[PDB]
From a paper:
A cellular surveillance system called the spindle checkpoint ensures that accurate chromosome segregation occurs by inhibiting the activity of the anaphase-promoting complex or cyclosome (APC/C) until all sister chromatids have achieved proper attachment to the mitotic spindle. The spindle checkpoint protein Mad2 binds to Cdc20, an activator of APC/C, and inhibits the complex. The Mad2 protein can adopt either an open or closed conformation. The conformational switch in Mad2 is critical for Cdc20 binding and APC/C inhibition, and is regulated by the protein Mad1.
C79 and C106 of Mad2 are located in close proximity and tend to form an intramolecular disulfide bond, causing conformational heterogeneity. To facilitate crystallization, we created a Mad2L13A,C79S,C106S triple mutant, which retained its abilities to bind to Cdc20 and inhibit APC/C in vitro (see below). However, we obtained crystals of Mad2L13A that diffracted X-rays to a minimum Bragg spacing of 1.95 Å and determined its structure using molecular replacement. The two monomers mainly interact through the C-terminal halves of their αC helices. The dimerization interface of Mad2L13A is symmetric and consists of residues from the C-terminal half of αC, R184 from β8′, and Q34 at the C-terminal end of αA. These residues form hydrophobic interactions and extensive networks of water-mediated hydrogen bonds. Bridged by two tightly bound water molecules, R133 from one monomer forms a network of hydrogen bonds with both the backbone and side-chain carbonyl groups of Q34 and the backbone carbonyl of T136 from the neighboring monomer. In unliganded C-Mad2, F141 points outward and engages in numerous interactions at the dimerization interface. Thus, R184 of β8′ indirectly contributes to Mad2 dimerization by forming an intramolecular hydrogen bond with the side chain of Q134, explaining the inability of O-Mad2 to form symmetric dimers. Mad2L13A, which predominantly exists as the symmetric C–C Mad2 dimer, is functional in cells and is active in APC/CCdc20 inhibition in vitro.
Numbering used by the authors: 0 to 110, 114 to 205
Write the structure that this text describes.
């Protein structure tokens, strides 16, 4: 007679996309911090995500810091207010900017009914991007200096700056080359990934 179905959220909503992208950044930032030795290897634990074994921090302060960033990102991503996220890697002793992991975000401001793209398909794309973050490091110059990180979120100039957040300098890098990574999309957001790395000197 009449076909009924118990509602089961399939596809992607603007909220779902924001969730997905913010989560990707949490895992991506964790991978970069581990791969560039920002935090010691023993401060990371193995976890399953996107069909991969990924390393995520156990450091209490870093967990809270990154969680705070991810929560804020979801809000701004839903609003289509994030233009890019950059993980700046600098020589801890000199402050020299050595790498800039740049994630340019494109948004569908019209995002309404849920979009027809499976979570699986999206995870498949993210999986390749995450693998490429680790793969890319094997092609960069050997890093043999202790470094620090800065996480910069570039937003629409008109956004309200929440408490605890601050307008920061751009942390310009110079004498760099780039490695373009695979992009991924939820159909609502598209995340482009690339790393700008400084060419060292023959000293
Ligand atoms: Cl781009
Ligand atoms: Cl690899
Ligand atoms: Cl720059
Ligand atoms: Mg040297």
């Amino acid at each position: 007679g009449m076909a009924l179905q118990l509602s089961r959220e399939q596809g992607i909503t603007a909220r779902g996309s924001a969730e997905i992208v913010a989560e990707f950044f949490s895992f991506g930032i964790n991978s970069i911090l581990y791969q560039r030795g920002i935090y010691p290897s023993e401060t990371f634990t193995r976890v399953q995500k996107y069909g991969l074994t990924l390393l995520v921090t156990t450091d209490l302060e870093l967990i809270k810091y990154l969680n705070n960033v991810v929560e804020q990102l979801k809000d701004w991503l839903y609003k289509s207010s994030v233009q890019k996220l950059v993980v700046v890697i600098s020589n801890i002793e000199s402050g020299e900017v050595l790498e800039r992991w740049q994630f340019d975000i494109e948004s569908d401001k019209t995002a309404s009914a849920p979009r027809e793209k499976s979570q699986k398909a999206i995870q498949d794309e993210i999986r390749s991007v995450i693998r490429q973050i680790t793969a890319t490091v094997t092609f960069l110059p050997l890093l043999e200096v202790s470094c620090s990180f800065d996480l910069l979120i570039y937003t629409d100039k008109d956004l309200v700056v929440p408490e605890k957040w601050e307008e920061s300098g751009p942390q310009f890098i110079t004498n760099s080359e780039e490695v373009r990574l695979r992009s991924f999309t939820t159909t609502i957001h598209k995340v482009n990934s690339m790393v700008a790395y400084k060419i060292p000197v023959n000293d």
